[PDB]
Coordinates of N, CA, C and O in Angstrom, one line a residue:
Chain A
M1 N -52.8 -62.4 206.3 CA -51.4 -61.9 206.5 C -50.5 -62.3 205.3 O -50.0 -61.4 204.5
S2 N -50.3 -63.6 205.1 CA -49.6 -64.0 203.9 C -50.6 -64.6 202.8 O -51.7 -65.0 203.2
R3 N -50.3 -64.4 201.6 CA -51.2 -64.8 200.5 C -50.6 -66.1 199.8 O -49.4 -66.3 199.6
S4 N -51.5 -67.0 199.6 CA -51.2 -68.3 199.0 C -51.1 -68.3 197.5 O -51.5 -67.2 196.9
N5 N -50.7 -69.3 196.8 CA -50.7 -69.5 195.4 C -51.6 -70.7 195.0 O -51.4 -71.8 195.5
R6 N -52.7 -70.4 194.2 CA -53.6 -71.5 193.8 C -53.2 -72.0 192.5 O -53.7 -73.1 192.1
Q7 N -52.5 -71.3 191.7 CA -52.1 -71.7 190.4 C -51.0 -72.7 190.4 O -49.8 -72.4 190.8
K8 N -51.3 -74.0 190.1 CA -50.4 -75.1 190.2 C -49.8 -75.4 188.8 O -48.8 -76.1 188.7
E9 N -50.5 -75.0 187.8 CA -50.2 -75.4 186.4 C -49.5 -74.2 185.6 O -50.0 -73.1 185.7
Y10 N -48.4 -74.5 185.0 CA -47.9 -73.6 184.0 C -48.7 -73.7 182.7 O -49.2 -74.8 182.4
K11 N -48.8 -72.6 182.0 CA -49.5 -72.7 180.7 C -48.8 -73.6 179.7 O -47.7 -73.3 179.3
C12 N -49.5 -74.7 179.4 CA -48.9 -75.8 178.6 C -47.8 -76.5 179.4 O -47.8 -77.7 179.4
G13 N -46.9 -75.7 180.0 CA -45.8 -76.2 180.7 C -44.7 -75.2 180.8 O -43.8 -75.3 181.7
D14 N -44.8 -74.1 180.0 CA -43.8 -73.0 180.0 C -42.4 -73.5 179.7 O -42.2 -74.5 179.0
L15 N -41.5 -72.8 180.3 CA -40.0 -73.1 180.1 C -39.5 -73.5 181.5 O -39.7 -72.8 182.5
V16 N -38.8 -74.7 181.5 CA -38.3 -75.2 182.8 C -37.1 -76.1 182.5 O -36.6 -76.2 181.4
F17 N -36.6 -76.7 183.6 CA -35.5 -77.7 183.5 C -36.2 -79.1 183.4 O -36.8 -79.6 184.4
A18 N -36.1 -79.7 182.2 CA -36.8 -81.0 182.0 C -35.9 -82.2 182.3 O -34.7 -82.1 182.1
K19 N -36.4 -83.2 182.9 CA -35.7 -84.4 183.2 C -36.2 -85.5 182.2 O -37.3 -86.1 182.4
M20 N -35.4 -85.8 181.2 CA -35.7 -86.8 180.2 C -34.8 -88.0 180.4 O -33.8 -87.9 181.2
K21 N -35.1 -89.1 179.7 CA -34.2 -90.3 179.8 C -32.8 -89.9 179.2 O -32.7 -89.6 178.0
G22 N -31.8 -90.0 180.1 CA -30.5 -89.7 179.7 C -30.1 -88.3 179.8 O -29.0 -87.8 179.4
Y23 N -31.1 -87.5 180.2 CA -30.9 -86.0 180.3 C -31.3 -85.5 181.7 O -32.4 -85.3 182.0
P24 N -30.2 -85.4 182.6 CA -30.4 -85.0 184.0 C -30.6 -83.5 184.2 O -29.5 -82.8 184.4
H25 N -31.8 -83.0 184.0 CA -32.1 -81.6 184.3 C -31.5 -80.8 183.1 O -30.4 -80.2 183.3
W26 N -32.2 -80.7 182.0 CA -31.7 -80.0 180.9 C -32.7 -78.9 180.5 O -33.9 -79.2 180.4
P27 N -32.3 -77.7 180.2 CA -33.2 -76.6 179.8 C -34.0 -77.0 178.6 O -33.4 -77.2 177.5
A28 N -35.3 -77.1 178.8 CA -36.2 -77.5 177.7 C -37.5 -76.8 177.8 O -38.0 -76.4 178.9
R29 N -38.2 -76.6 176.7 CA -39.5 -75.9 176.7 C -40.6 -76.8 176.3 O -40.4 -77.7 175.5
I30 N -41.8 -76.5 176.7 CA -43.0 -77.3 176.5 C -43.6 -76.9 175.1 O -43.4 -75.8 174.6
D31 N -44.3 -77.9 174.5 CA -45.0 -77.7 173.3 C -46.3 -78.5 173.3 O -46.3 -79.6 173.8
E32 N -47.4 -77.9 172.8 CA -48.7 -78.5 172.8 C -49.4 -78.6 174.1 O -48.8 -78.2 175.1
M33 N -50.6 -79.0 174.2 CA -51.4 -79.1 175.4 C -52.7 -79.9 175.1 O -53.7 -79.4 174.7
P34 N -52.6 -81.2 175.4 CA -53.7 -82.2 175.1 C -54.9 -81.9 176.0 O -55.0 -82.5 177.1
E35 N -55.8 -81.0 175.7 CA -56.9 -80.6 176.4 C -58.2 -80.4 175.6 O -59.3 -80.5 176.1
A36 N -58.0 -80.1 174.3 CA -59.1 -79.8 173.4 C -59.8 -81.1 173.0 O -59.5 -81.7 172.0
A37 N -60.9 -81.4 173.7 CA -61.7 -82.5 173.5 C -61.0 -83.8 173.7 O -61.0 -84.4 174.8
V38 N -60.2 -84.2 172.7 CA -59.4 -85.4 172.8 C -58.0 -85.0 173.3 O -57.4 -84.0 172.9
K39 N -57.4 -85.8 174.1 CA -56.0 -85.6 174.6 C -55.1 -86.5 173.9 O -54.0 -86.1 173.4
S40 N -55.4 -87.8 173.9 CA -54.7 -88.8 173.1 C -55.5 -90.1 173.1 O -56.2 -90.4 174.0
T41 N -55.5 -90.7 171.9 CA -56.2 -92.0 171.8 C -55.5 -93.1 172.6 O -54.4 -93.6 172.2
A42 N -56.0 -93.4 173.7 CA -55.4 -94.3 174.6 C -56.4 -95.5 174.9 O -57.6 -95.2 175.1
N43 N -55.8 -96.7 175.0 CA -56.6 -97.9 175.4 C -57.7 -98.2 174.4 O -58.5 -99.1 174.6
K44 N -57.8 -97.4 173.3 CA -58.9 -97.6 172.3 C -58.4 -98.4 171.2 O -57.2 -98.3 170.7
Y45 N -59.2 -99.3 170.7 CA -58.9 -100.2 169.6 C -59.3 -99.6 168.3 O -60.4 -99.0 168.2
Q46 N -58.5 -99.7 167.3 CA -58.9 -99.1 166.0 C -59.8 -100.1 165.2 O -59.3 -101.1 164.7
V47 N -61.1 -99.9 165.3 CA -62.0 -100.7 164.7 C -62.4 -100.2 163.3 O -63.1 -99.2 163.2
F48 N -61.9 -100.9 162.3 CA -62.2 -100.5 160.9 C -63.4 -101.2 160.4 O -63.3 -102.4 160.2
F49 N -64.5 -100.5 160.2 CA -65.7 -101.0 159.7 C -65.4 -101.5 158.3 O -65.1 -100.8 157.4
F50 N -65.6 -102.8 158.1 CA -65.3 -103.6 156.9 C -66.1 -103.1 155.7 O -65.5 -102.7 154.6
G51 N -67.4 -103.1 155.9 CA -68.3 -102.8 154.8 C -68.4 -101.3 154.5 O -68.2 -100.8 153.4
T52 N -68.7 -100.5 155.5 CA -68.9 -99.1 155.4 C -67.5 -98.4 155.3 O -67.4 -97.2 155.2
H53 N -66.4 -99.2 155.3 CA -65.0 -98.8 155.2 C -64.7 -97.5 156.0 O -64.1 -96.6 155.6
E54 N -65.1 -97.6 157.3 CA -65.0 -96.4 158.2 C -64.2 -96.8 159.4 O -64.4 -97.8 160.1
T55 N -63.2 -95.9 159.8 CA -62.4 -96.2 161.0 C -63.1 -95.6 162.2 O -63.5 -94.4 162.2
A56 N -63.3 -96.4 163.2 CA -63.8 -96.0 164.5 C -63.0 -96.5 165.6 O -62.1 -97.4 165.5
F57 N -63.1 -95.9 166.8 CA -62.4 -96.3 168.0 C -63.3 -96.8 169.0 O -64.2 -96.1 169.5
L58 N -63.1 -98.1 169.4 CA -64.0 -98.8 170.3 C -63.2 -99.5 171.3 O -62.0 -99.6 171.3
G59 N -63.9 -100.1 172.3 CA -63.3 -100.9 173.3 C -63.6 -102.4 173.2 O -64.3 -102.8 172.3
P60 N -63.0 -103.2 174.2 CA -63.3 -104.6 174.2 C -64.8 -105.0 174.3 O -65.2 -105.9 173.6
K61 N -65.5 -104.2 175.1 CA -66.9 -104.5 175.3 C -67.8 -104.1 174.2 O -68.9 -104.5 174.0
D62 N -67.2 -103.3 173.3 CA -67.9 -102.8 172.1 C -67.7 -103.7 170.9 O -68.2 -103.5 169.8
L63 N -66.9 -104.8 171.2 CA -66.6 -105.8 170.1 C -67.0 -107.2 170.5 O -66.6 -107.7 171.6
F64 N -67.9 -107.8 169.7 CA -68.4 -109.1 170.0 C -67.9 -110.2 169.0 O -68.2 -110.0 167.8
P65 N -67.2 -111.2 169.4 CA -66.6 -112.2 168.6 C -67.7 -113.1 167.9 O -68.4 -113.8 168.6
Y66 N -67.7 -113.1 166.6 CA -68.7 -113.9 165.8 C -68.2 -115.3 165.6 O -68.9 -116.2 165.2
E67 N -66.9 -115.5 165.9 CA -66.3 -116.9 165.9 C -67.2 -117.8 166.7 O -67.3 -119.0 166.3
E68 N -67.7 -117.3 167.8 CA -68.7 -118.1 168.6 C -70.1 -117.6 168.5 O -71.1 -118.3 168.3
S69 N -70.2 -116.2 168.5 CA -71.5 -115.6 168.6 C -72.1 -115.2 167.3 O -73.0 -114.4 167.2
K70 N -71.6 -115.8 166.2 CA -72.2 -115.6 164.9 C -73.7 -115.9 164.9 O -74.4 -115.3 164.2
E71 N -74.1 -116.9 165.7 CA -75.4 -117.3 165.8 C -76.3 -116.4 166.6 O -77.5 -116.4 166.5
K72 N -75.6 -115.6 167.4 CA -76.3 -114.7 168.4 C -76.7 -113.4 167.7 O -77.8 -112.9 168.1
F73 N -76.0 -112.9 166.8 CA -76.3 -111.6 166.2 C -76.7 -111.8 164.7 O -77.6 -111.0 164.3
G74 N -76.2 -112.8 164.0 CA -76.6 -113.0 162.6 C -76.5 -111.8 161.8 O -75.5 -111.2 161.6
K75 N -77.7 -111.4 161.3 CA -77.8 -110.1 160.6 C -79.1 -109.4 161.1 O -80.2 -109.7 160.6
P76 N -79.0 -108.6 162.1 CA -80.1 -107.9 162.8 C -80.8 -106.9 161.9 O -81.9 -106.5 162.2
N77 N -80.1 -106.3 161.0 CA -80.7 -105.3 160.1 C -80.7 -105.7 158.7 O -79.8 -106.4 158.2
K78 N -81.7 -105.3 158.0 CA -81.8 -105.6 156.5 C -81.5 -104.3 155.8 O -82.4 -103.5 155.5
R79 N -80.2 -104.1 155.5 CA -79.8 -102.9 154.7 C -78.9 -103.4 153.6 O -78.2 -104.4 153.7
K80 N -78.8 -102.6 152.5 CA -78.1 -103.1 151.3 C -76.6 -103.2 151.7 O -75.9 -104.1 151.3
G81 N -76.1 -102.1 152.4 CA -74.7 -102.2 152.8 C -74.4 -103.1 154.0 O -73.4 -103.7 154.1
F82 N -75.4 -103.1 154.9 CA -75.3 -103.9 156.1 C -75.3 -105.4 155.7 O -74.3 -106.1 156.1
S83 N -76.3 -105.8 155.0 CA -76.4 -107.2 154.6 C -75.3 -107.7 153.7 O -74.7 -108.8 153.8
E84 N -74.9 -106.8 152.8 CA -73.8 -107.1 151.8 C -72.5 -107.2 152.6 O -71.7 -108.2 152.3
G85 N -72.2 -106.3 153.5 CA -70.9 -106.3 154.2 C -70.9 -107.5 155.1 O -69.8 -108.2 155.3
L86 N -72.0 -107.7 155.8 CA -72.0 -108.8 156.8 C -72.0 -110.1 156.1 O -71.5 -111.1 156.6
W87 N -72.5 -110.2 154.9 CA -72.5 -111.4 154.0 C -71.1 -111.7 153.6 O -70.6 -112.8 153.7
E88 N -70.3 -110.6 153.2 CA -68.9 -110.8 152.9 C -68.2 -111.3 154.2 O -67.1 -111.9 154.0
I89 N -68.7 -111.0 155.3 CA -68.2 -111.6 156.6 C -68.8 -112.9 156.9 O -68.2 -113.7 157.6
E90 N -70.0 -113.2 156.4 CA -70.7 -114.5 156.7 C -69.9 -115.7 156.1 O -70.1 -116.8 156.5
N91 N -69.1 -115.4 155.1 CA -68.3 -116.5 154.5 C -66.8 -116.4 154.9 O -65.9 -116.7 154.2
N92 N -66.6 -115.8 156.1 CA -65.3 -115.5 156.7 C -64.4 -116.8 156.8 O -64.9 -117.9 156.9
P93 N -63.1 -116.6 156.7 CA -62.1 -117.7 156.7 C -62.0 -118.4 158.1 O -61.9 -119.6 158.2
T94 N -61.9 -117.6 159.1 CA -61.7 -118.1 160.5 C -63.0 -118.4 161.1 O -63.5 -117.7 162.0
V95 N -63.7 -119.5 160.6 CA -65.0 -119.9 161.1 C -64.9 -121.2 161.9 O -64.6 -122.3 161.3
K96 N -65.1 -121.1 163.2 CA -65.1 -122.3 164.0 C -66.5 -122.9 164.0 O -67.3 -122.8 164.9
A97 N -66.8 -123.6 162.8 CA -68.1 -124.3 162.6 C -69.2 -123.3 162.5 O -69.3 -122.4 163.3
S98 N -70.2 -123.6 161.6 CA -71.4 -122.8 161.5 C -72.3 -123.2 162.7 O -73.1 -122.4 163.1
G99 N -72.1 -124.4 163.2 CA -72.9 -124.8 164.3 C -72.5 -124.2 165.6 O -71.9 -124.8 166.5
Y100 N -72.9 -122.9 165.8 CA -72.7 -122.2 167.0 C -71.3 -121.9 167.3 O -70.7 -120.9 166.7
Chain B
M1 N -41.6 -117.1 174.7 CA -42.1 -117.0 176.0 C -41.4 -115.9 176.8 O -40.5 -116.2 177.6
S2 N -41.7 -114.7 176.5 CA -41.0 -113.5 177.1 C -41.5 -113.2 178.5 O -42.6 -112.6 178.6
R3 N -40.8 -113.7 179.5 CA -41.1 -113.4 180.9 C -42.4 -114.1 181.4 O -42.4 -115.1 182.1
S4 N -43.5 -113.5 180.9 CA -44.8 -114.0 181.3 C -45.9 -113.6 180.3 O -45.8 -112.4 179.8
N5 N -46.8 -114.4 180.0 CA -47.9 -114.1 179.0 C -49.0 -113.3 179.7 O -49.8 -113.9 180.4
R6 N -49.0 -112.0 179.5 CA -50.0 -111.2 180.1 C -50.9 -110.5 179.0 O -52.0 -110.0 179.3
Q7 N -50.3 -110.4 177.8 CA -51.0 -109.8 176.7 C -52.2 -110.6 176.3 O -52.1 -111.7 175.9
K8 N -53.4 -110.0 176.4 CA -54.6 -110.6 176.1 C -55.5 -109.7 175.3 O -56.8 -110.0 175.3
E9 N -55.0 -108.7 174.7 CA -55.8 -107.8 173.9 C -56.2 -108.3 172.6 O -55.7 -109.4 172.2
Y10 N -57.1 -107.7 171.9 CA -57.5 -108.1 170.6 C -56.3 -107.8 169.6 O -55.8 -106.7 169.5
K11 N -55.8 -108.8 169.0 CA -54.6 -108.7 168.1 C -55.0 -108.4 166.7 O -55.9 -109.0 166.1
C12 N -54.4 -107.4 166.1 CA -54.7 -106.9 164.8 C -54.8 -108.1 163.8 O -53.7 -108.7 163.5
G13 N -55.9 -108.3 163.2 CA -56.1 -109.4 162.3 C -57.4 -110.2 162.7 O -57.9 -110.9 161.8
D14 N -57.9 -110.0 163.9 CA -59.1 -110.5 164.3 C -60.3 -109.7 163.8 O -60.1 -108.6 163.4
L15 N -61.5 -110.2 163.8 CA -62.7 -109.5 163.3 C -63.9 -109.9 164.2 O -64.0 -111.1 164.6
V16 N -64.7 -108.9 164.5 CA -65.8 -109.1 165.4 C -67.0 -108.2 165.1 O -66.8 -107.3 164.2
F17 N -68.1 -108.4 165.7 CA -69.2 -107.4 165.5 C -69.0 -106.2 166.3 O -68.8 -106.2 167.5
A18 N -68.9 -105.0 165.6 CA -68.6 -103.8 166.3 C -69.9 -103.0 166.6 O -70.9 -103.0 165.8
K19 N -70.0 -102.4 167.7 CA -71.1 -101.6 168.1 C -70.8 -100.1 168.0 O -70.1 -99.6 168.9
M20 N -71.2 -99.5 166.9 CA -71.0 -98.1 166.7 C -72.3 -97.3 166.6 O -73.3 -97.9 166.7
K21 N -72.1 -96.0 166.5 CA -73.3 -95.1 166.3 C -74.0 -95.4 165.0 O -73.4 -95.1 163.9
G22 N -75.2 -95.8 165.0 CA -76.0 -96.1 163.8 C -75.8 -97.5 163.4 O -76.3 -97.9 162.3
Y23 N -75.0 -98.3 164.1 CA -74.7 -99.7 163.8 C -74.8 -100.5 165.0 O -73.9 -100.5 165.9
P24 N -76.0 -101.3 165.2 CA -76.2 -102.1 166.3 C -75.0 -103.1 166.5 O -74.4 -103.1 167.6
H25 N -74.8 -103.9 165.5 CA -73.7 -104.9 165.5 C -73.2 -105.1 164.0 O -73.8 -105.9 163.3
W26 N -72.2 -104.3 163.6 CA -71.7 -104.4 162.3 C -70.3 -105.0 162.3 O -69.4 -104.4 163.0
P27 N -70.0 -106.2 161.7 CA -68.7 -106.8 161.7 C -67.6 -105.9 161.2 O -67.5 -105.6 160.0
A28 N -66.6 -105.6 162.1 CA -65.5 -104.7 161.8 C -64.2 -105.4 162.1 O -64.1 -106.2 163.1
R29 N -63.2 -105.0 161.4 CA -61.8 -105.6 161.6 C -61.2 -105.0 162.8 O -61.3 -103.8 163.0
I30 N -60.4 -105.8 163.5 CA -59.7 -105.2 164.7 C -58.2 -104.9 164.3 O -57.5 -105.7 163.7
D31 N -57.9 -103.6 164.5 CA -56.6 -103.1 164.3 C -56.0 -102.6 165.6 O -56.8 -102.0 166.4
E32 N -54.7 -102.7 165.8 CA -54.1 -102.3 167.0 C -53.8 -100.8 166.9 O -54.0 -100.2 165.8
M33 N -53.3 -100.2 168.0 CA -53.1 -98.8 168.1 C -51.9 -98.4 167.1 O -50.9 -99.1 167.1
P34 N -52.1 -97.3 166.4 CA -51.1 -96.9 165.3 C -49.7 -96.8 165.8 O -48.7 -97.2 165.1
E35 N -49.5 -96.3 167.0 CA -48.2 -96.2 167.6 C -47.4 -95.1 166.9 O -46.6 -95.4 165.9
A36 N -47.6 -93.9 167.3 CA -46.9 -92.7 166.7 C -47.1 -91.5 167.6 O -47.9 -90.6 167.3
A37 N -46.5 -91.5 168.8 CA -46.7 -90.5 169.9 C -48.1 -90.8 170.5 O -48.2 -90.7 171.8
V38 N -49.1 -91.0 169.7 CA -50.4 -91.4 170.2 C -50.5 -92.9 170.2 O -50.3 -93.6 169.2
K39 N -50.9 -93.5 171.4 CA -51.1 -94.9 171.6 C -51.6 -95.1 173.0 O -52.4 -95.9 173.3
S40 N -51.1 -94.2 173.9 CA -51.4 -94.2 175.3 C -51.0 -92.9 175.9 O -50.5 -92.0 175.2
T41 N -51.2 -92.8 177.3 CA -50.8 -91.6 178.0 C -51.7 -90.4 177.6 O -51.4 -89.8 176.6
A42 N -52.7 -90.1 178.4 CA -53.7 -89.1 178.1 C -53.0 -87.7 178.1 O -52.8 -87.1 177.1
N43 N -52.7 -87.2 179.3 CA -52.1 -85.9 179.5 C -50.6 -86.0 179.5 O -50.0 -86.3 180.5
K44 N -50.0 -85.8 178.3 CA -48.5 -85.8 178.2 C -48.1 -84.6 177.4 O -48.7 -84.2 176.4
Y45 N -47.1 -83.9 177.9 CA -46.6 -82.7 177.2 C -45.5 -83.0 176.3 O -44.7 -83.9 176.5
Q46 N -45.4 -82.3 175.2 CA -44.3 -82.4 174.3 C -43.2 -81.4 174.7 O -43.6 -80.3 175.1
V47 N -42.0 -81.8 174.6 CA -40.9 -80.9 175.1 C -39.8 -80.8 174.1 O -39.3 -81.8 173.6
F48 N -39.5 -79.5 173.7 CA -38.4 -79.2 172.8 C -37.1 -79.0 173.6 O -37.0 -78.1 174.3
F49 N -36.2 -79.9 173.4 CA -34.9 -79.8 174.0 C -34.0 -79.0 173.1 O -33.6 -79.4 172.0
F50 N -33.5 -77.9 173.7 CA -32.6 -77.0 173.0 C -31.2 -77.7 172.9 O -30.4 -77.4 172.0
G51 N -31.0 -78.6 173.9 CA -29.7 -79.2 173.9 C -29.4 -80.1 172.7 O -28.7 -79.7 171.9
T52 N -30.1 -81.2 172.7 CA -29.9 -82.2 171.5 C -30.8 -81.8 170.4 O -30.8 -82.5 169.3
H53 N -31.5 -80.7 170.5 CA -32.4 -80.2 169.4 C -33.5 -81.3 169.1 O -33.7 -81.6 167.9
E54 N -34.0 -81.9 170.2 CA -35.0 -82.9 170.0 C -36.4 -82.5 170.5 O -36.6 -81.5 171.0
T55 N -37.3 -83.4 170.3 CA -38.7 -83.3 170.8 C -39.1 -84.5 171.5 O -39.2 -85.6 170.9
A56 N -39.4 -84.4 172.8 CA -39.8 -85.6 173.6 C -41.1 -85.4 174.3 O -41.8 -84.4 174.1
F57 N -41.5 -86.4 175.1 CA -42.8 -86.4 175.8 C -42.5 -86.5 177.3 O -41.9 -87.5 177.8
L58 N -42.9 -85.5 178.0 CA -42.7 -85.5 179.5 C -44.0 -85.1 180.2 O -45.0 -84.8 179.6
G59 N -43.9 -85.1 181.5 CA -45.1 -84.8 182.3 C -44.7 -83.7 183.3 O -43.6 -83.3 183.4
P60 N -45.7 -83.2 184.1 CA -45.5 -82.1 185.1 C -44.4 -82.5 186.1 O -43.6 -81.7 186.5
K61 N -44.4 -83.8 186.4 CA -43.5 -84.3 187.4 C -42.0 -84.3 186.9 O -41.1 -84.3 187.7
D62 N -41.9 -84.1 185.6 CA -40.5 -84.2 185.0 C -40.1 -82.8 184.6 O -39.0 -82.6 184.0
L63 N -40.9 -81.8 184.9 CA -40.6 -80.4 184.6 C -40.3 -79.7 185.9 O -41.2 -79.5 186.7
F64 N -39.1 -79.2 186.1 CA -38.7 -78.6 187.3 C -38.5 -77.1 187.1 O -37.9 -76.6 186.2
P65 N -39.0 -76.2 188.1 CA -39.0 -74.8 188.0 C -37.5 -74.2 187.8 O -36.6 -74.5 188.6
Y66 N -37.4 -73.5 186.7 CA -36.1 -73.1 186.2 C -35.5 -72.0 187.0 O -34.3 -71.8 187.1
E67 N -36.4 -71.1 187.5 CA -35.9 -69.9 188.2 C -35.0 -70.3 189.4 O -34.1 -69.6 189.7
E68 N -35.4 -71.4 190.0 CA -34.6 -71.9 191.1 C -33.6 -72.9 190.6 O -32.4 -73.0 191.1
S69 N -34.0 -73.8 189.7 CA -33.2 -74.9 189.2 C -32.0 -74.4 188.4 O -30.9 -74.9 188.4
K70 N -32.2 -73.3 187.6 CA -31.1 -72.7 186.8 C -29.9 -72.3 187.7 O -28.8 -72.4 187.3
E71 N -30.3 -71.9 188.9 CA -29.2 -71.5 189.9 C -28.6 -72.7 190.6 O -27.5 -72.6 191.1
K72 N -29.3 -73.9 190.5 CA -28.7 -75.1 191.1 C -27.9 -75.9 190.1 O -26.8 -76.3 190.5
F73 N -28.3 -76.0 188.9 CA -27.6 -76.8 187.9 C -26.8 -75.9 186.9 O -26.7 -76.3 185.8
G74 N -26.4 -74.8 187.4 CA -25.7 -73.8 186.5 C -24.2 -74.3 186.2 O -23.3 -73.6 186.6
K75 N -24.1 -75.4 185.5 CA -22.8 -75.9 185.1 C -22.8 -76.2 183.6 O -23.2 -77.3 183.2
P76 N -22.4 -75.3 182.8 CA -22.4 -75.4 181.3 C -21.1 -75.9 180.7 O -20.3 -76.5 181.4
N77 N -20.9 -75.6 179.4 CA -19.7 -75.9 178.7 C -19.6 -77.4 178.4 O -20.2 -78.2 179.0
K78 N -18.8 -77.6 177.3 CA -18.6 -79.0 176.8 C -19.8 -79.5 176.1 O -19.7 -80.2 175.0
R79 N -21.0 -79.3 176.7 CA -22.3 -79.7 176.1 C -22.9 -78.5 175.3 O -23.4 -77.6 175.9
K80 N -22.7 -78.6 174.0 CA -23.2 -77.5 173.1 C -24.6 -77.1 173.4 O -24.8 -75.9 173.8
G81 N -25.5 -78.0 173.3 CA -26.9 -77.7 173.4 C -27.3 -77.2 174.8 O -28.3 -76.5 175.0
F82 N -26.5 -77.5 175.8 CA -26.7 -77.1 177.1 C -26.3 -75.6 177.3 O -27.1 -74.8 177.7
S83 N -25.1 -75.3 176.8 CA -24.7 -73.9 176.8 C -25.5 -73.0 175.9 O -25.9 -71.9 176.3
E84 N -25.8 -73.5 174.7 CA -26.7 -72.8 173.8 C -28.1 -72.6 174.4 O -28.6 -71.5 174.4
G85 N -28.6 -73.7 174.9 CA -30.0 -73.6 175.5 C -30.0 -72.7 176.7 O -31.0 -71.9 176.8
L86 N -29.0 -72.8 177.5 CA -29.0 -71.9 178.7 C -28.9 -70.4 178.4 O -29.6 -69.6 179.0
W87 N -28.2 -70.1 177.3 CA -28.1 -68.7 176.9 C -29.4 -68.3 176.2 O -30.0 -67.3 176.5
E88 N -29.9 -69.2 175.3 CA -31.1 -68.9 174.5 C -32.2 -68.7 175.5 O -33.2 -68.0 175.1
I89 N -32.1 -69.3 176.6 CA -33.1 -69.2 177.7 C -32.8 -68.0 178.6 O -33.7 -67.2 178.9
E90 N -31.5 -67.7 178.9 CA -31.2 -66.6 179.8 C -31.5 -65.3 179.1 O -32.0 -64.4 179.8
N91 N -31.2 -65.2 177.8 CA -31.4 -63.9 177.1 C -32.9 -63.8 176.6 O -33.3 -62.8 176.1
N92 N -33.7 -64.9 176.8 CA -35.1 -64.9 176.3 C -35.9 -66.0 176.9 O -36.2 -67.0 176.3
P93 N -36.2 -65.8 178.2 CA -37.0 -66.8 179.0 C -38.5 -66.6 178.9 O -39.2 -67.6 178.7
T94 N -38.9 -65.4 178.9 CA -40.3 -65.0 178.7 C -40.6 -64.7 177.3 O -41.7 -64.3 176.9
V95 N -39.6 -64.7 176.5 CA -39.6 -64.3 175.1 C -39.9 -62.8 175.0 O -41.0 -62.3 175.2
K96 N -38.8 -62.1 174.8 CA -38.9 -60.6 174.8 C -39.4 -60.0 173.5 O -38.6 -59.8 172.6
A97 N -40.7 -59.9 173.4 CA -41.3 -59.3 172.2 C -42.0 -58.0 172.6 O -42.7 -57.4 171.8
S98 N -41.8 -57.6 173.8 CA -42.4 -56.3 174.3 C -41.4 -55.4 174.9 O -41.3 -54.2 174.5
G99 N -40.6 -55.9 175.9 CA -39.6 -55.0 176.5 C -38.2 -55.3 176.0 O -37.3 -55.7 176.8
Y100 N -37.9 -55.2 174.7 CA -36.6 -55.3 174.2 C -36.5 -54.7 172.8 O -37.1 -55.2 171.8

């Protein structure tokens, strides 16, 4: 008898009355639409690879403190850039003793 | 000692073993989030305010249907961008590039 509406989303957001901080219902239009693969870099840490000089985005669990676990990982790979970069790190300033 | 110490994230300046693609554990520097619209909030819409001629970030909950709201909050004047925006919207809400 009656037909429903399943479309809940405006395309991007369309044109509406926007409620912003200090703006109680002001005519405003939408721009952009964070849906293409990445929406926004959130809760991600900017991990800048020291040796390979490359910016990556990782999380807390993707990062292991050598201040204590220097002994745990050492230098697991023998590569010219790997060993060189990790060596530049092996003489790091913030070292809480070489003994573990 | 601002209120309570809850911040426990990796603070820009620390350095750890990073786990990236092609790198089991490569020591990388920790940098915090750039902070420039992107930092957090995954799905957020950008909104162009005709009023103050600004661009802000809002969500679906902050965008109210104008076809009904325009009739509710129809109180212009004194506020330039409100009057300008209301007209710029009234004479072109769907953007008349076909039937005008």
